[PDB]
Scaffold this active site. Structure first.
Site, PDB file in Angstrom:
ATOM      1  CG  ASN A 104      -2.029   1.016   1.177  1.00  0.00           C
ATOM      2  OD1 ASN A 104      -2.546   1.278   0.103  1.00  0.00           O
ATOM      3  ND2 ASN A 104      -2.461   1.549   2.313  1.00  0.00           N
ATOM      4  CG  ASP A 125       3.201  -1.843   2.449  1.00  0.00           C
ATOM      5  OD1 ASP A 125       2.009  -2.159   2.307  1.00  0.00           O
ATOM      6  OD2 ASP A 125       3.549  -0.644   2.636  1.00  0.00           O
ATOM      7  CD1 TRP A 126      -0.816  -3.195   3.578  1.00  0.00           C
ATOM      8  CD2 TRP A 126      -1.328  -5.214   4.287  1.00  0.00           C
ATOM      9  NE1 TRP A 126      -1.423  -3.039   4.776  1.00  0.00           N
ATOM     10  CE2 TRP A 126      -1.756  -4.285   5.250  1.00  0.00           C
ATOM     11  CE3 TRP A 126      -1.555  -6.573   4.552  1.00  0.00           C
ATOM     12  CZ2 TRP A 126      -2.385  -4.656   6.422  1.00  0.00           C
ATOM     13  CZ3 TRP A 126      -2.168  -6.972   5.701  1.00  0.00           C
ATOM     14  CH2 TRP A 126      -2.578  -5.992   6.622  1.00  0.00           C
ATOM     15  CD  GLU A 160      10.471  -0.377   6.819  1.00  0.00           C
ATOM     16  OE1 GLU A 160       9.280  -0.005   6.994  1.00  0.00           O
ATOM     17  OE2 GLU A 160      11.340  -0.357   7.723  1.00  0.00           O
ATOM     18  CG  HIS A 164       7.050   1.678   4.520  1.00  0.00           C
ATOM     19  ND1 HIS A 164       7.238   0.496   5.217  1.00  0.00           N
ATOM     20  CD2 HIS A 164       6.057   1.452   3.644  1.00  0.00           C
ATOM     21  CE1 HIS A 164       6.382  -0.414   4.763  1.00  0.00           C
ATOM     22  NE2 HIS A 164       5.650   0.130   3.817  1.00  0.00           N
TER      23      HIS A 164
HETATM   24 CL   LIG Z   1      -1.412   0.204   5.184  1.00  0.00          CL
END
Ligand SMILES: [Cl-]
Length: 292
Positions: free
Chosen positions: A38, A103-104, A127, A269
């Site tokens: 995201n 991330d996701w 990350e 990030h």
């Molecule tokens: Cl998020």
């Protein structure tokens, strides 16, 4: 740092919906599957893929509702992404893969790996999502932001109505300034506010302070898996980082089996936007020993 996206388009029909993906490199080896999170897309991998394509197939889908993939009217729960990504992987007939995740995309990739352990030959990660047992463990300066994203009504006003994840969070968590051309690539899927549903559901799915319970439990499960898995791991980290601070990267280096860690330098990030060349070159260098 390159701003273009010099990849021929590919689309595959998945669950009645078209999903867009990058697909470059030789067909006759183990593919490398790149998973964004995201509020990004395959564009996030644009400067990393060229380092790996010379030696391996590189597949980088746009998650459902994101990038150039179709936009069904879903709740865009993590479970929805799971359903679509599982079906994408099968639609392409993939067998064994190397994962490159963030991330996701890291929750998706680790969850897939746990369920398909014989089909994962290595995991490069950065990350990545782990449980945040309390809010004090979330990065201090982003606590208010994410609490508001997860607050009734307010979060939807910020992320959907005002595009706060794209216009605010994304550049905030890159150390160098993103250019307008780069921002326009990230803005394009989300020009219509209503299409921003995934961008709001995602932070509401983050495993923070025990909520939501289903995500906390599945993230704890893949982390338990990861801690006992012999699969080769390549972990990139930056300073100060964001959800993987330097001290956590060091803890993971010691605890996770067969884990090589690479310091990329300054990073928050979206590490791929700060040092794509080292990320790509180190992935390329690390792949050959995974083959046997
Ligand atoms: Cl998020």
């Amino acid at each position: 740092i390159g701003t273009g996206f010099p990849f021929d388009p590919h689309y595959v029909e998945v669950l009645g919906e078209r999903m867009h993906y990058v697909d470059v490199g030789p067909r006759d080896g183990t593919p490398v599957l790149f998973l964004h999170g995201n509020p990004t897309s395959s564009y996030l991998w644009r400067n990393i893929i060229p380092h790996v394509a010379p030696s391996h197939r590189c597949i980088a889908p746009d998650l459902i509702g994101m990038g150039k993939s179709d936009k069904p009217d879903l709740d865009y729960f993590f479970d929805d992404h799971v359903r679509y990504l599982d079906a994408f992987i099968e639609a392409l007939g993939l067998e064994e893969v190397v994962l490159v995740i963030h991330d996701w995309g890291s929750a998706l990739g680790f969850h897939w790996a746990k369920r398909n352990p014989e089909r994962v030959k290595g995991i490069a990660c950065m990350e990545f999502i782990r449980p945040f047992p309390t809010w004090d463990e979330w990065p201090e300066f982003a606590r208010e932001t994410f609490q508001a994203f997860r607050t009734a009504d307010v979060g939807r006003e910020l992320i959907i109505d005002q595009n706060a994840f794209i216009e605010g969070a994304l550049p905030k968590y890159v150390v160098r300034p993103l250019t307008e051309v780069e921002m326009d690539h990230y803005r394009e899927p989300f020009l219509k506010p209503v299409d921003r549903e995934p961008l709001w559901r995602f932070p509401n799915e983050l495993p923070i302070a025990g909520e939501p319970a289903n995500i906390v439990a599945l993230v704890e499960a893949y982390m338990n898996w990861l801690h006992q898995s012999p699969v080769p791991k390549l972990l990139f980290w930056g300073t100060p980082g964001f959800i993987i601070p330097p001290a956590e990267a060091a803890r993971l280096a010691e605890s996770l089996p067969n884990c090589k860690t690479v310091d990329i330098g300054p990073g928050l990030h979206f590490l791929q936007e700060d040092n794509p060349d080292l990320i790509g070159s180190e992935i390329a260098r690390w792949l050959p020993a995974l083959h046997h």
